[PDB]
Amino acid sequence: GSHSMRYFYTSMSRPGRGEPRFIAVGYVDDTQFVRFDSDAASQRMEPRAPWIEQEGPEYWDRNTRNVKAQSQTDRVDLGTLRGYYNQSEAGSHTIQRMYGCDVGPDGRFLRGYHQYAYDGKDYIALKEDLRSWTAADMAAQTTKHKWEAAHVAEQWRAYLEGTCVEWLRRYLENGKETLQRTDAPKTHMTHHAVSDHEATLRCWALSFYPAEITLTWQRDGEDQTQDTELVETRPAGDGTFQKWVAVVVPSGQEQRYTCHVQHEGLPKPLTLKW
Amino acid sequence: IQRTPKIQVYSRHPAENGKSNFLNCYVSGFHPSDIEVDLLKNGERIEKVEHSDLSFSKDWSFYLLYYTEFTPTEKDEYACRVNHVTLSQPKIVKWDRDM
Amino acid sequence: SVYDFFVWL
């Protein structure tokens, strides 16, 4: 189907404790594949998925130099923002940048993204047409006019429609044995005595990829939401994901309830009974 | 703005006593990124805990997975302790193999 | 692969 590549940059100032910490992570779909940490000893962009390890020294030098340069220009941007918002030099602040691209099943460009945030709040973003900017306030509007005059959007569009897409296709092909595979959820149920009058049925979905999944309960075929609890999807720590949904039922009525699991890796949805 | 962390404590694989596993503490939805997360065994800090690389979600809030290999038993209690600027005191969430 | 041009706020 469709795929995405995303890079997430974070700089965190720490006045009195040296230079800001910069971190970069890169993802393809729900799989992290690179990382950079300015506090780490390596000072290198590093592989975090096996299929990226085959890239040669040129790839690693270039990616390292580029994110290293970002850590350095981020320090300038932090100073600029502090001036824009008239903030003292004593406080700690954060800048975040997200960018990347989506392609369809045919590997062709679908859309591009570039957004920036200061202290967790939107600052500036490239519109979806990749030709103009939207600014969240007047400080950001200052950046917008500057980037308009300098035709910054054109540089981003060239990257997002060209370079970004070309690398994403390459990663998809090189990592196809995993990136283009689905791991269907492994499902089971547990039963827990709440009181003498009630019990909890918990329906589990484990070891699945990608993260997208839907877990629901039915009671004699009727959708149930009351007395249900659905936890947020969480990483197993091995590249796969976990989720569960539970329902409180009158003791003796367990048999009325069915758990339903929908996932990309399932040719048809699962129905689990206790 | 400031955002308080959501916390989930759980095992990588379903727990079976004596069987080698990983104890996970997933913290998400927080801002800023400075966060203290410790895994506890019987009320004491576990030594060597690793974590995933810091990343963030659509709303700019951060998320991290802290983890350690462990061998769960009937009686050993595990938990995750989290402190953050949004917290008046550290939040402690017990590990429940049922969840 | 990451972007490689220089732009400041």
Mutate to test the interface with B, among A7, A8, A28 (most CBs of B within 10 A): A8
Q: How far is A236 from chain C (nearest CA, A)?
A: 27
**Cα–Cα distance for residue pair B55/A72, rounded to 1 Å:** 19
**Distance from the first to the final alpha carbon of chain A:** 34
Interface test with B, best of A17, A21, A96 (most B CBs within 10 A): A96
- State chain A's maximal CA–CA distance in angstroms: 72
Please report, for the domain that includes residue B56, its CATH number.
Answer: 2.60.40.10
Resolution in Å equals 1.8
Nearest Cα to A74, choosing from A9, A133, A124, A16?
Answer: A9
Give which of A155, A157, A161 to mutate to test C binding, by max C Cβ within 10 Å.
A155
CA distance B49 to B69: 9
Q: Name the nearest CA neighbour of B12 among B46, B45, B50.
A: B50
The distance in angstroms from the start CA to the end CA of chain C is 22
> CA-nearest residue of chain A to C2?
A63
Distance (Å) from the C-alpha of residue A56 to the closest C-alpha of chain B? 23
Chains touching A, CB cut-off 8 Å, 3+ pairs: B, C
**Residue B25, both tokens:** 């503490």
Ramachandran quadrant class, A195 (left: phi over 0; alpha: psi -120 to 50; beta: rest): beta
- Looking at chain C, which residue has its C-alpha nearest residue A36? C2
Chains C and A touch (3+ CB pairs under 8 A): yes
Cα A109 from chain centroid? 19
| Cα–Cα separations (whole angstroms), residue A219 to A116, A229, A255 | 46, 15, 9
The residues, any chain, with a CB within 8 Å of residue A79's CB and separated by 6 or more, are none
Q: Alpha-carbon distance A187 to A120, whole Å?
A: 37
Domains and CATH numbers, chain A: 1-181 (3.30.500.10), 182-274 (2.60.40.10)
Q: Tell me the C-alpha distance between B61 and B49, whole Å.
A: 22
Q: Are A124 and A142 in contact (CB under 8 A)?
A: no
Give the integer Cα–Cα distance in Å for B88 and A147.
Answer: 42
Beta carbons within 8 Å of B40's beta carbon, 6+ residues apart: B46, B78, B79, B80, B81, B92
Is residue A243 within 8 A of residue A213, CB to CB? The reply is yes
Q: In C, which residues are within 8 Å of A165 by CB distance?
A: none
Length of chain C as a residue count: 9
Q: How far apart are the first and last CA of chain B?
A: 31
A18 torsion bin: left (phi>0), alpha (psi -120 to 50), beta (else): left
On the 0-12 / 13-18 / 19+ scale of CB atoms within 10 A, A105 is exposed
Provide the sign of the torsion angle of the four alpha carbons B68, B73, B76, B77, taken in this order: positive
Helix or strand (DSSP H, E) at A82:
helix A57-84
Q: Which of A207, A205, A211, A185 is CA-nearest to residue A246?
A: A205
Cα–Cα dist A132/A144, whole Å:
9
- Which residue from C2, C5, C8 is facing A63, i.e. has the nearest CB? C2
Beta partners for residue A34, in sequence order: A26, A47
Q: Do A238 and B12 touch (CB under 8 A)?
A: yes
- The residues pairing with A262 across neighbouring beta strands, listed in sequence order, are A214
CA distance A68 to A51: 23
- What amino acid is encoded at A178 in this protein? T
Beta strands in chain A (DSSP E): 3-12, 21-28, 31-37, 46-47, 94-103, 109-118, 121-126, 133-135, 186-193, 198-208, 214-219, 222-224, 228-230, 234-235, 241-250, 257-262, 270-273
Query: Does residue A29 contact residue A168 with C-beta atoms inside 8 Å?
Result: no
Q: How many domains does chain B have?
A: 1
Shortest CA distance to B72 belongs to which of B98, B37, B36?
A: B98
Write the residue in A80, A99, A159 that is nearest to C9 by C-beta: A80
Q: How far is A135 from chain B (nearest CA, A)?
A: 16
Ordered alpha helix ranges (H), A108-241: 138-149, 152-158, 164-174, 176-179
Tokens of residue B94, six digits: 């017990």
- Cβ separation of B67 and A237 shorter than 8 Å? yes
Provide the token pair at A258: 């069915």
Structure tokens at A175: 């990592």
Q: Residue B44 sits in which domain range?
A: 1-99
Neighbours of A126 (CB within 10 A): 22
* Nearest-by-Cβ selection for C6 from A24, A73, A159: A73
Residues 6+ apart with CB under 8 A from B86: B2, B3, B4, B5, B30
- Any chains having at least 3 CB pairs less than 8 A from chain B are A
**How was it solved?**
X-ray
